[PDB]
Each structure stands twice: as structure tokens, then as C-alpha cells.
Amino acid sequence: VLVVTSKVKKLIKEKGQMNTSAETIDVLSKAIEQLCLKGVESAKADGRKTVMARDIVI
Amino acid sequence: VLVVTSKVKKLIKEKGQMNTSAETIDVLSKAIEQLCLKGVESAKADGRKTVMARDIVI
């Protein structure tokens, strides 16, 4: 799991009075994994050894 | 911070032999915050009290 589950659930509850399903946590974690892997692609294509904010295309 | 920093850095290092900048962590966390808030919008518009995977549009 790549998201901080407790903090995600807190944000959703305090900002929306919403509960958070388990599958929501899974999708968020998968989204982080994909952003990271695309970031690696971008950084390497640029000949760099560090993934930077400009590599996280959002 | 809404991402698990240590686990993000591990993924990027093990999958890309890349380092991870601090600003990368910040962008990932901001992305999670925005996905969560959009998820609250979608769930509430549907009259629900739980943010579900279908509310996280990725």
C-alpha cells in the first residue's frame, strides 16, 4: 500500500463526512504506483538519475 | 503527507535505480489529496456516504 490509509480516511471523513471503501484505498495506491513508474520513464528518457516533480504528470 | 514516502522511494529505486526528490513526494501527496476531494464530490453527487473506487477517476 503506497498511501497512508489512516490519513486518507481522515481527510475524506473530515472534509466530506464520507467513509472510505477498501477498494478506494487500492485504487489510490495503484494510481501512485503508475505515477511513479511513469516518472521513472520520464526521468530516464531525460538521462537523469532522480525522479523529479516535473516527471509526475498530473 | 498522504503517500508512504519510504515505500515510494523503495519502488522508484528498485524498479528504476532512480532516486526520488522531495518535490516528487509533495506532488504525489497533492495528487492523492485532489483525487480524494474529487471522490467526495462524486460520491456526494450520487447521494452516497462512502467514497468508492468508481469515484476515483484515474
Residue numbers in the entry:
A (entry chain A), B (entry chain A): 4 to 61
Direct quotes from the study:
Crystallization trials were conducted with purified HBb, and within a few days, we obtained crystals that diffracted to atomic resolution. Except for the first three and last three amino acids, the full chain is clearly resolved in the electron density map. The asymmetric unit contains a single chain of HBb, forming a dimer through crystallographic symmetry. HBb exhibits a characteristic dimeric histone fold, with monomers consisting of three α-helices (α1, α2, α3) connected by two loops (l1 and l2). Dimerization occurs through the antiparallel alignment of the central α2-helices of the two monomers at an angle of approximately 25°. The dimer is stabilized primarily by hydrophobic contacts along the interface, involving residues L31, I35, and L38 in α2, as well as contributions from α1 (e.g. V11) and α3 (e.g. I59). In contrast to the archaeal histone HMfB, the α2-helix of HBb is one turn shorter, and α3 comprises only a single helical turn. Like HMfB, HBb features a conserved intramolecular salt bridge, known as the RD clamp, involving residues R51 and D58. In HBb, this motif is augmented by D49, which forms an additional salt bridge with R51, potentially stabilizing the conserved KT motif in loop l2. Four of the six DNA-binding residues in HMfB, including K52 and T53, are conserved in HBb, indicating a potential for DNA binding.
